[PDB]
Structure formats: structure tokens, C-alpha cells
């Protein structure tokens, strides 16, 4: 009974969390698992600030009200070679990553590991926070407030 978390650097706060590096949340998750993380789905003016400082993925994810992927680069294969707040328009489908905001997080970017997931709640779950860098945090625990999610 486990699930992993990758998650990125945090830029003016913003960061990607995946769930077991599959696109696999959906948006009711999304909401618990940054609460898990005393974080909020980010707004779009929170994202584009993010992006501003360096913040881009090639992963679709939720924030507040759309589902996007923030883009610096060009690139072919994420977000069809757009640059910015890319919105996802058209999708058949329910499930992504998700973006998630902390406010105490530092201003600008923040390639530090992330080391806690501090508003998890009592749970059977092994959860794994994993690092880009490899760098791992596990705890028993469970974030999840929604049936339909489990
Ligand atoms: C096109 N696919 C991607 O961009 C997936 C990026 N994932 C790849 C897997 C992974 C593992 C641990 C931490 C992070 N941030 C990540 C990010």
C-alpha cells in the first residue's frame, strides 16, 4: 500500500507533483494532496508569476479552475511548441499531475529537496516523496478526504 510523489523545485512557491510518475489525479485528489503539502492549487496569476522565475514542466496539471502546463522553451512534444501558461483546452479525460502553491515557500527559485509532508494525516499508506534528485522522505500516512479517490 504505497504511492510515490514526484516532486519538483519550487519557483515563487509554485511546484509539480506527479503520483506514481503517472498521470493519475484527479481534481478532488489534486485539493488534498496540496493541503497535504499545507499548500493550495495554485491561481493562474501564482502560476504565471512561477513561470516568470523559471518554472516550466512538460506535464499537464491542475491549478485552480484549468488544467496547464507552463512553458519557457519551445518545445515540440510539450504543449504542442507553445511558450507560457499553456491551457489545456480539449481533453476527453480526468486525470493529471497536479500543481500545488506554497506561500512560505522562498520567493524565487527553490531547488532544495523537498524533505516533509507536514498535514498529512493517520493513515495505512507508505508514502514516498521522491526528488528529482533521488533524494527520498517516507511516511505512513494518507491525504485523501474523497471515496471516489481511493
Ligand atoms: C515528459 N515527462 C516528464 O516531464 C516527467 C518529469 N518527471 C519525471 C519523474 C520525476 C521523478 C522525481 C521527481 C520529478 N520531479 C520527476 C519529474
Redesign the pocket.
Known sequence: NQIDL???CRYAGVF?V?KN?RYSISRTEAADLCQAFNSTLPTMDQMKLALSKGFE???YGFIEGNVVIPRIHPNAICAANHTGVYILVTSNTSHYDTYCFNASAPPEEDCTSVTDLPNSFDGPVTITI???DGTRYSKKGEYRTHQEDI
Open positions: 514526484n516532486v519538483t509539480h506527479e510518475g514542466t512538460c506535464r521522491v526528488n528529482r
